[PDB]
């Protein structure tokens, strides 16, 4: 218990997102090592969540929601929130 405390996560997808547009962030599991990463997005529409197992030792996550609103993005390592998880993420309607 508490492996997750050594795991860090950042990138634009844990800060802001646009509806229908993929939101990417990174998770660096160097210190905690290997384990089970469970990602949750909780909000007014269903997220599609993808992983990217990078050679750099980091893991990539991209998610897409379609409805603008306020989402919470959870990152658990071995079933336990990592620091600052849940992340509160505002998803806006796209521009352009």
């Amino acid at each position: 218990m508490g492996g997750a405390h050594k795991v860090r996560a950042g990138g634009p997808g844990l800060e802001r997102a646009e509806a229908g547009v993929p939101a990417e962030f990174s998770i660096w599991t160097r210190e905690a090592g290997a384990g089970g990463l469970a990602i949750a997005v909780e909000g007014p529409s269903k997220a599609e969540i993808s992983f990217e197992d990078r050679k750099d030792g980091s893991c990539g996550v991209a998610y897409v929601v379609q409805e603008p609103g306020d989402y919470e993005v959870s990152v658990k390592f071995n079933e336990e929130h990592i620091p600052d998880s849940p992340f509160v993420v505002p998803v806006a309607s796209p521009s352009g």
Partner: peptide
């Protein structure tokens, strides 16, 4: 209404 979507992956060593 509120949807919660969970996906799991195993970050390798």
């Amino acid at each position: 209404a509120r949807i919660k979507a969970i996906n799991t992956f195993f970050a390798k060593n």
